[PDB]
Symmetry: D4
Subunit: 161 residues, 8 copies
């Protein structure tokens, strides 16, 4: 069965990270969500990452802000693909988040999304694309999603009043 | 049967993108490679991206620098996951490459790697992690890879002379 | 007959891109406006750009933000001059938009203006200057616009309180 | 007859700006090249820009680096379209050049291209596209140029 | 007799440049203030800069935003010292203004101060320091201003509630 | 008996981190050095950091570049003060390193120094300052160090 | 007895710097707080820094913004550890503050924390960790704080709604 | 007599700062030069700044890199105009130097010039313009310098014929 984990260091991250869960629901991909802090709960992060695959999780989506270490550290402790969402910060508006997630050393990858809500939405969509390789029923849903994007642009044509 | 496409806009990007191919070889994942330019051959890009899935491609790794539109445009034209590698730029150090790739709108994701050779290496490893959901024999190889990372660090212990 | 096209990937961009249309109206230059999304409607973008010259469009003004690919992709698909307007973004302050548009490779130019409303207004004025080469009636209008700018400065003198 | 002016503040900019001239020659578009400095010869710059249109210039391509004021000041003094090429600098890699040129407030436009040689090459090509409006001969030349760009990529298929 | 001119391209800049005038008033230094746009009124800019010294202007303080050319062009057209104040821009927060002003080539100097109100206030104070060389009675006022700065800090001590 | 640990994710960081050890030797402060990688040896990192205090370590100096997670993760796992040295990166000039180290959210601190060799030298000096609290012998050494800095400047006066 | 000093150039900085004092209170570490401006009260700064150790201060936490010189100058005038907190600035969002503080030359260190409230809170915690070396009672309090952070994360699990 | 002081933290800065002295010599303006380190010799810095005016110094030119505090701290301690030259740094290309110098909060000004050699050259010229208010023989020399700049450009025009 398909399963994604959606994780973040604080419940304050939820307004953003819920966008990943919204897309997973749209594609009918099961997920778990939880607060896992790289800095406040480092041992609970290590346990989560290490145990994820054997628990049946296929992909981890992880959001973090500032000195954003959660995605990279989780990726270092699992063989699963990890998608990292940079969360926008008060001062640097997510530039710190972006660089601290994307610039991983050769050897340990993180699939980095856009900063903020767009990135959280894209993490869910990216997870659906990844899962569509082994789960062919998703391909049709992905085709229909693409059609919905075309429809959205058509719907916007009369909004340049 | 697993297959990854490794693409880039120029042959001058090959010195970097060869790292992706190197890692795909390490995991025994079949690949094809070619030059696909978003700006010099936009129609060929459209055809390549649109037809990749039906031909048997599972993942596209796309490298580009500067006004680095290739990964995001390819992603817009396929239901496959696309991994985008920002190439370092002589002037702006790959900052233009990075922002052009990572900041995709909600709706069309690109899995963005680190700038340069690190990102290309990571694109290959990430593709293996993605394919390990569908192809379970890759998990053992990914575990072996972890072990080799640990050994690399052990070998460095006496080099602090 | 003169004709300009003003395009953007979202009706959310209209608040900015209307500035281009406002200046086209000032110079009495006919135009069309449309939503054309590089990522949500890539095939329609290809058709729009490819057909533009045959449809009698002389200049394309294209606005985009973030991973701002619309102007450069349109420019790759027509030999008309394309003016690219970077739209301000809520993390990188349009720096992503700007670099994505201006850093086009040798071979495929985009005439880039300032981030935001200033750039959209200036795209309209720039289109007027471009069209004045082969439409001499515009030269008088451009001279009169100079006079209006000088007058606007005079009208500001009493505001330094 | 068509005519483009290619200008720059220093002879040190010539290697870069010749890329503009090379593309103008490729498209058989006449041009003049000159050194015109916004900061060292401000009055000459004013005269050049003010008189350009009456002297038969259709487009001005202006390269500048650092506190790059030449394109914007020329644009403020002519009704002609001005294309600005940011020249790479040593400290800031042309970022100062780029922002000084592109960020014109509403009212006076500059068409800005990429930093350095790529931008210089593109200024010449952009000038050709501007002059191609309802001009089938130039449209043909631009289409042939497209064909060379496609060929360039197809040739690279074996260089991996 | 001492005189300073305070100039800017738009009345939108006045809410910043007013701090220059406020400090000049505090030091009892006569000034004039005017809108002079490098882009909208280039010929009047040339005239203003060229005539300033013979008119008895001692120093020009010039504010500009974005592609901020006013201070550098004025400096090129006068032998007077020119103080340049970068104005914060909506998108790039005055980094464009700052680089456009400060990065003048060797040969034509601009005395650059901080982005925004701090820079405008400091331009007025700097002008007083410059004028104090040939106008000795200003030294006493500058000493009194320093005393006022020490008092301001003392007044803040009970505000750490 | 005070002890400092100097750690880094690669021996290729030793180029920079040796400067920390050099200053510790200058102040006669005992130390150990080790390669500890946040991404390649995360489980070892956890052991090193969580056990540091029981191992007799008083201060940890950690260098890292790029996605520079080592100092912050180490800090999250110990009650010891952690000094983080950002290592210059070929592309982003250590700005990625700096932001990934300094921008710790409220709750877990890292004492961050300058990018590169300056920062590594300063991490060693900062550790000395930390150990000097109410320690007159180290205070004396720091005073002598101050005098050497003054002398260095005096020595440069005839070089203008 | 333990003692920390918390200083800042302006009472405007207090709403941020009070977080340092809040954490020192949490750990029962005695402190003094004062406005000390590197630029408005340079002589008083020099005296404060020079006398701090003699007066029994163990650690100085100093906040500063813009051309942020307070932490580096204080550090040059004491052999005590100095913690520098970059204050968020209106225009550059504390990037100026950060670079001005962190980029100290080899020879004179400043322990730099994050921009804004995070850095101020962390300066107090960092001072507690520093003092725990020679004040063993603080180790227990630091252990308590660690446990509290874990409990706070556990309390957030039901807030993803 | 007129007198300028040219100061810097290290003899490593002399290759750059000598450009200021070159221009002072061009205008026959007397000067002294000294190494003054804000961080290694802070008390000498305080003394130098505080005593400069009574000794006959009219203007201080100060160069500094990195956490470049010398110009701002000197300015805080004198009523003289202070010109600050940002010295290029290895990692950050003088961006740290620039922001640490130019971003002075309102109250204490520094006249900032370009990064590196251009800025040092311009500090000397700016000092001449400042001194020309009080010393009218300089106006003639500044007019001569204007003419020399025109000739330099004419020389380039003629060489490229």
């Amino acid at each position: 069965a398909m399963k994604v984990a959606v994780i973040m260091g604080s419940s304050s991250d939820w307004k953003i990270m819920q966008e990943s869960c919204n897309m997973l629901d749209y594609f009918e991909i099961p997920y778990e969500k939880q607060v896992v802090s790289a800095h406040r709960t480092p041992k609970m992060m290590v346990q989560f990452a290490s145990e994820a695959r054997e628990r049946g999780i296929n992909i981890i989506i992880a959001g973090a802000g500032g000195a954003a270490h959660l995605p990279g550290m989780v990726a270092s402790l699992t063989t699963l693909p990890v998608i990292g969402v940079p969360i926008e910060t008060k001062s640097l508006k997510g530039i710190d988040s972006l660089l601290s997630i994307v610039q991983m050393p050769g050897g340990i990858p993180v699939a980095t999304t856009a900063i903020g809500a767009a990135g959280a939405k894209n993490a869910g969509i990216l997870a659906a694309r990844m899962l569509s390789i082994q789960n062919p029923s998703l391909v049709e849903k992905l085709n229909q999603y693409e059609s919905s994007l075309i429809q959205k642009v058509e719907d916007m044509q009369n909004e340049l009043q």
